[PDB]
Amino acid sequence: AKLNLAVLNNVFSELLTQEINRSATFLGLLSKYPERKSNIQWGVGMGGT
Amino acid sequence: AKLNLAVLNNVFSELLTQEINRSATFLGLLSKYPERKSNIQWGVGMGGT
Fold first, then answer.
1. CA distances in angstroms from A8 to A15, A16, B4, listed in the order given
2. Are B48 and A2 in contact (CB under 8 A)?
3. Nearest CA in chain B to A6
4. Is B48 in contact with A1 (CB distance < 8 Å)?
5. How far is A14 from chain B (nearest CA, A)?
């Protein structure tokens, strides 16, 4: 018959461990640009002469 | 054919009589407290010695 076997409390501690891998490497070097249009159009030149 | 018979206007008076019973008597003396927690836990002491 313990006098504090039901009053002692369970407290965690500030030790959150980052376990999941959410990395972004190839997104991090593509030299981003703000295109506010409907579709990107440029010109490709083949031969023929 | 009375001169003012259909051009009467019905005006109520300032005599609202609220007749419902919305009484909070026992709630009015309980010494209200806030509780921003999941549930209240306290200790109750028994015998044993």
1. 21, 23, 86
2. no
3. B43
4. yes
5. 20
